Design a protein around this ligand. Structure first.
Ligand code: HEM
Ligand SMILES: O=[N+]([O-])c1ccc(O)cc1
Length: 137
């Protein structure tokens, strides 16, 4: 289920984080707009950059914290607020997040492993909803 998936991802968080973010970037090329430093680089090139691995993991670490504090895949309002208020999220809208989780759910489904995809799909939708309630456009 969801709780076990959190453990699966945390277990090899660096690898999963990179794979899923890369799936995101490749599914939605315009999204690289929020990432000028990743432009014009293959997946393997990106993985060779120190900040790519470091940032992607720190992103997914916070995502797993938010996921774990959730109740029935509903994130805490305060976690949503944190994500809205982060300086690094200045220019973002809920659409950026919607797309991230569409990619994440697609990755899970295509994976050999028994991820609870429906739960992550709900988590993504409920996070988007919470981001909106916490004031993200
Ligand atoms: C639940 C989903 C997300 C979580 C938990 C999250 C968390 C974080 C964290 C912890 C950082 C700081 C990383 C660091 O400084 O090392 C960060 C930075 C950043 N995030 Fe988010 N993030 C999420 C979704 C997104 C999405 C969907 C986008 C855009 C599509 C985005 C855009 C950025 C940008 C532009 C930065 C600063 C530059 C960079 O680190 O590449 N974030 N995020
Ligand atoms: O998955 N994400 O949204 C990310 C991943 C890496 C990063 O540096 C910023 C955002």
């Amino acid at each position: 289920g969801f709780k076990q998936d959190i453990a699966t991802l945390r277990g090899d968080l660096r690898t999963y984080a990179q794979d899923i973010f890369l799936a995101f970037l490749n599914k939605y090329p315009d999204e690289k707009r929020n990432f000028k430093n990743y432009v014009g680089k293959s997946d393997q090139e990106l993985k060779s950059m120190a900040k790519f691995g470091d940032h992607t993991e720190k992103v997914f670490n916070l995502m797993m914290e938010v996921a774990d504090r959730a109740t029935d895949c509903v994130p805490l309002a305060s976690d949503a607020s944190t994500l809205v208020q982060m300086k690094q999220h200045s220019g973002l809208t809920t659409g950026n997040f919607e797309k991230l989780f569409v990619a994440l759910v697609e990755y899970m489904r295509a994976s050999g492993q028994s991820f609870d995809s429906q739960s992550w799909d709900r988590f993504g939708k409920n996070l988007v909803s919470a981001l909106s309630s916490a004031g993200m456009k």
